[PDB]
Amino acid sequence: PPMTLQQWIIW
Amino acid sequence: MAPPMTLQQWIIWKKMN
Amino acid sequence: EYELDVEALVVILRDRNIPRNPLHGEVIGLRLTEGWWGQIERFQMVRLILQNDDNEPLQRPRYEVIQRAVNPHTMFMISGPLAELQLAFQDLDLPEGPLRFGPLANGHYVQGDPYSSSYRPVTMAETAQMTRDELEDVLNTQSEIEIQMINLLELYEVETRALRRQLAERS
Amino acid sequence: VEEYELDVEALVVILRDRNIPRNPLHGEVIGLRLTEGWWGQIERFQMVRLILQNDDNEPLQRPRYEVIQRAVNPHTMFMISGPLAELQLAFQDLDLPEGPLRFGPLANGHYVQGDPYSSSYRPVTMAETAQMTRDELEDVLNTQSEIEIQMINLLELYEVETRALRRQLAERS
């Protein structure tokens, strides 16, 4: 499951 | 000292010895 | 591999109005409009690393440097000054050798192309940082670029002669 | 000091074949234009000084020439043009000078529109770069980069020249 920048930032 | 030589002057000199 | 600040990268993208959302392992080309080397465009190709090999998120994100020529037409591209891009890409610098020329790393100079118009040679500040193999590759590439430039100057001189002729007889 | 052997009789043949009436002196500087060589069919430059006699001006049994680290000025110097293989008969083991010096008139990177030697100028080949040292490469690169700046300026000037010329041609149809 590759993450996007927003998907990493909300973490 | 002798003067500086041209090319032919040298060739003529070499033709001596 | 060097540190990547995701927050600053997001800010950098939004400021340019780019709707793109880069992924993990995403290959990004960078057009550095200016840096310590002066005010002339240079290129660098990087890759984002957000997680590990098992896709578990890294609380300290990274980016790696890929040693390949940036192709602005077939690649995702961010442009801006080095100082600004360093807010995201920590310790970012020029790549090895002719690669810094990007679309001209292979020495292909094209008439009418804006990237060929923007191309400028290496400064003496750049060369003091280079190895012999590095310096040879740059010199080979600049030679290829010059060959194209000289052919283009002959073509220009031929057309100018022809147009002034055509103008003379039609005036 | 870099000195190699000189065949005087071959030099006489070369000068006469080029209709050069005068014979050079001992200690005279010769500017050479190498029209072609191992590097390619592009023109290169080398500077030499003749040694026909020793310190007491006694003629040498085997004359020599020395390579001078200075850029050739074809406008002011005694010049000989020809291929490397023809000049190697007179100047034994003749090769290219160090760094940008090989460019001669453009060793200083002074590129000019209309200058014959700027038009004849060609950058270094891959055979040349393989032989160079780090300092040579950095020097050559410095000069070629300055020539590039000049060439870029002339390209943008020709683009405006061509454009305005086509415009004045179009209004006259």
Numbering used by the authors:
A (entry chain G): 3 to 13
B (entry chain F): 1 to 17
C (entry chain A): 9 to 179
D (entry chain B): 7 to 179
Direct quotes from the study:
PFV Gag is a 648 polypeptide and the major FV structural protein in the assembled virion. Moreover, in all retroviral subfamilies Gag carries out the same functional roles including assembly, nucleic acid packaging, transport to and budding through the cytoplasmic membrane of the producer cell as well as trafficking through the cytoplasm of the target cell and uncoating. Here we report the crystal structure an amino terminal domain from the Gag of PFV (PFV-Gag-NtD), provide the molecular details of the interaction of this domain with the N-terminal leader sequence from the PFV Envelope (PFV-Env) and demonstrate that the PFV-Gag-NtD is also the target for Trim5α restriction factors. Our data reveal that the FV Gag is unique and structurally unrelated to the Gag protein of other retroviruses.
Also unique to FVs is a requirement for the interaction of the Gag protein with the viral envelope protein (Env) in order to bud from the producer cell. Env then directs the intracellular transport of the assembled particles to enable mature viruses to bud at the PM or sometimes into intracellular vacuoles. This interaction guarantees Env incorporation into virions and the loss of either interacting domain (Gag-NtD or Env-LP) results in the intracellular stranding of assembled FV capsids. In the structure, residues 7–16 of the Env leader peptide comprise the amphipathic α-helix bound in the Env binding site of the Gag-NtD and residues 1–6 provide intramolecular hydrogen bonding that stabilises the helical conformation. Therefore, the hydrophobic interface observed in the structure likely represents the complete interaction between the leader peptide and FV Gag. Mutations in the Env binding site of PFV-Gag-NtD have been shown to affect viral assembly, egress and infectivity.
